[PDB]
Amino acid sequence: TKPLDGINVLDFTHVQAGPACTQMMGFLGANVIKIERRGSGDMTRGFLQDKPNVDSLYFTMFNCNKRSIELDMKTPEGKELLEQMIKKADVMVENFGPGALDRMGFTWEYIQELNPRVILASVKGYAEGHANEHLKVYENVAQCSGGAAATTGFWDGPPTVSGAALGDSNSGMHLMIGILAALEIRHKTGRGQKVAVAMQDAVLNLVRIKLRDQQRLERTGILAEYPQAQPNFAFDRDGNPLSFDNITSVPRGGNAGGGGQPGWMLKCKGWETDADSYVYFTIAANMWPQICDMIDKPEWKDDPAYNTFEGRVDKLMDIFSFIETKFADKDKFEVTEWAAQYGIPCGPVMSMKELAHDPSLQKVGTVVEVVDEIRGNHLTVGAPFKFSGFQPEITRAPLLGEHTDEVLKELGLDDAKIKELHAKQVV
Amino acid sequence: TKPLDGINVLDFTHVQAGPACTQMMGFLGANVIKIERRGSGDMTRGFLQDKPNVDSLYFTMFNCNKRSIELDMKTPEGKELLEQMIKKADVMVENFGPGALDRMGFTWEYIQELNPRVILASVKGYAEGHANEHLKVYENVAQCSGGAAATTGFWDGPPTVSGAALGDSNSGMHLMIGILAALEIRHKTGRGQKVAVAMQDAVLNLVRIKLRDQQRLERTGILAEYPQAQPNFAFDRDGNPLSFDNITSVPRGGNAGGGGQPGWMLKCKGWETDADSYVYFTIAANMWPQICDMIDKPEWKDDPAYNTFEGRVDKLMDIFSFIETKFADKDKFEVTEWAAQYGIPCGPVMSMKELAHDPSLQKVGTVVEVVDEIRGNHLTVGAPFKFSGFQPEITRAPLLGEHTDEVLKELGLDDAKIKELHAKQVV
Ligand code: NA
């Protein structure tokens, strides 16, 4: 028994945000019917393919546990089909532009008329009511709109995008929270709701720690845990000093700790010829004696220039630089093992190659080999929530229109009618 | 009616990941009782305070819509009190070290006996059964473990952390999905489950697109949309040109498009003195004619060297450099409007200062002013999901043990018993 067994999802989504939401629902047991445009379908199918005329890894890794039906929703027969499907549905998920679904003939009011129990879930770029609510947002545009780009990277370089899908998949996971919340009250009210997530808002949620920083900066004029708080440390491209004297918006802090304890990205053996030969090393305020033992600096234990966070503000980047010299002949795994002996939070920069072939992630079901006889097997990320009572069973992504007839038969249509729909090119 | 009205949460969490989960449940109506250590409580209270002896902004921005009780769980009386609270709870939430809750007297097995309906939810560093299951993980350590640092930043720079809480808040939002899914299944089964989210796995879920890229690279030996795919553009430390000939793990691509169309971060007027005077500019394949119009390059519309993705691969960075020269005397909002009249979605980098005081975000309830009559008002981020049926009502964060006696009275304790517990230093 899986959490969303019996939950029927009408899935209009494409690209990444929406599809990530409905795929993860499918991993938890939902019956996901992906409605695709006749003859082309989700643009990810043909987006950066690795084999010619085979659905891409972009498509397969975001569309497992779904069935595909092709539908021309601009036809009268298509609209009648939708109406029938909505009456069988628990959740409708879409990421069209503002007002698109209303123009297709299906307002929220009309949807409620068709099915009082159906939840309507949307991914948007900007929140409804925002000055910016209508225009488009790709992955990195949301990262920029939500404060992530401005606070990511280095003080002497540009705003920097995250490799993680802070815009797309993050918004999809946020929409999943919204949909599940709507399911929970429906047990009381018996009624579906409209739920929407703007990509800017999903990013801003994760950037909450930097809105803390903005207020601290306004109130106090300094962020003591940032590199720029160290006198004479940070400079711009042209050699101008960067101190909090002149800083009015949360700056980029390089590899500083964020919402963690102070930390830094330190080089390990092989860093010149291996881009990922680094650890993240933390200096937790309650672990200074342990650190002093590790690096053989007993004289730093009782010295007030070193043994409080306040004392270290003027030299912390010097301390990271010295710690780094201890790792010069050790790889990242052996530095991680060394720090762990002291209980010091520290871990490796894992490469994508290391992650793809890691035995442990395959053991726990986080990296999963999907069985696909048509395209060949591939890896995907599984469910990142682990449950005592069940396990996902991940199955291959559908071919375009693979399940059209199967789905129409479930709506009780006879063979003659299915033949008519094909002949009319409705399906 | 709010989704989680009547859901009683026994909240052991501290720092960021756990508290972000329980706060957002509170925003959706949950009754959150935060169990804190007598005398000190959640470390965020005293972490980077902006005023002496006043709860920090880290604390207040992650602990609205909660009540605080102080409890010594090392005492037999405290353990008995916990047993009573567990019997009235729907969800227990924790982010202690591995085994820590077992050691304080409450194994999953014991918990099930006390209350067959209760859900136990945990934030972990690595998943149960992982080779690294006993490693301590916070924020940037998790960004490193889950593939984000390896794939964020520049090819000639270090692995780079996101300013967004990819580790902590992201893991908390993933746990909330798990909890809501456990509630769904409990409606059918009548039984609670154990759910857990590892920070590595929450990060890797958002890094799915780079696991796409790792398989593409292994299968084909190139990622055509990356800057390194342009011959003689990207160089290493020593001045040698990088190419995918010798790249076997997904590299850092600077400000390339990720899951979006090809893009780059482009300077606008004032970039030397304003760190956030930038726009993200996307070159979507079927927008090339509009882009040619915008930048007055009519020759490029019909030239096969320029008018397809494939043709642009050997010079895309040159094209970006050229487009950037057109923005040198325009600010990021002027550039965005100029692109928008050609139908081109361009995105400004929003500073934290701009976001904190943006009218629109306060209009839609995404940035919210909390009325805090104890500490003075502050801003926070609200619910990033917007519902037709209700609005969150955000109330200020609790003082340490502010609600101890209130909570004990709800358990059925009389004033004499409560007085005894205070005297014995159990609360
Ligand atoms: Na030593």
Swiss-Prot record, chains A, B:
CoA binds at residues 14-17, 37, 71-74, 95-97, 103, 136-139. GO terms for molecular function: formyl-CoA transferase activity. Transmembrane segments: none annotated. Optimum pH is between 6.5 and 7.5. Homodimer. GO terms for biological process: oxalate catabolic process. Its main location: cytoplasm. It is an enzyme of class 2 (transferase). Its EC number is 2.8.3.16. This is Formyl-CoA:oxalate CoA-transferase. Changing D168S: Loss of CoA-transferase activity. Keywords: Cytoplasm, Transferase. InterPro entries: CoA-transferase_III_domain, CoA-Trfase_fam_III, CoA-Trfase_III_dom3_sf, CoA-Trfase_III_dom_1_sf, Formyl_CoA_transfer. It is found in: Cytoplasm. Changing D168E: Loss of CoA-transferase activity. Belongs to the CoA-transferase III family. Frc subfamily. It comes from Oxalobacter formigenes. Inhibited by the sulfhydryl reagents N-ethylmaleimide and p-chloromercuribenzoate, and by chloride. Competitively inhibited by acetyl-CoA. One of its GO terms (cellular component) is cytoplasm. Substrate binds at G259, G260, Q261. It catalyses: formyl-CoA + oxalate = oxalyl-CoA + formate; formyl-CoA + succinate = succinyl-CoA + formate. The active site is at D168. It comes from the Bacteria.
